[PDB]
């Protein structure tokens, strides 16, 4: 559930870069 | 990118800009 942690909390351009592929 | 939440294109606009060729996973159900 990345959205649950990236939609109810926050994300970083690298933290979001980690969800690539 | 800053310290805000995400969802919809907001999450892709970030995943797409951070991934691009590696595309992104993006989940929902599991």
Concatenate the DSSP letters of all residues of A1-21 into one string. Answer: -HHHHHHTT---TTTTTTTB-
Which positions in chain B touch A21 (Cβ < 8 Å)? Answer: 19, 22-25
Task: Tell me the technique behind this structure.
Answer: NMR
Q: Which domain holds residue B23?
A: 1-30
- Closest by alpha carbon to A18, among B6, B15, B1, B11? B15
Specify which residues B24 forms β-bridges with: A20
Interface test with B, best of A12, A17, A18 (most B CBs within 10 A): A17
Counted domains in chain B: 1
How far, in Å, are B18, B25, B30 from residue A7 at the CA level? Answer: 17, 15, 15
Q: Phi, psi at residue B11, to the nearest 5°?
A: -75, -40
Say yes or no: A5 contacts chain B, CB-CB below 8 A: no
């Amino acid at each position: 559930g990345i959205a649950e942690q990236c939609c109810t909390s926050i994300c970083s351009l690298y933290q979001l870069e980690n969800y690539c592929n | 990118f800053v310290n805000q939440h995400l969802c919809g294109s907001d999450l892709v606009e970030a995943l797409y800009l951070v991934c691009g060729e590696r595309g992104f996973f993006y989940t929902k159900p599991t």
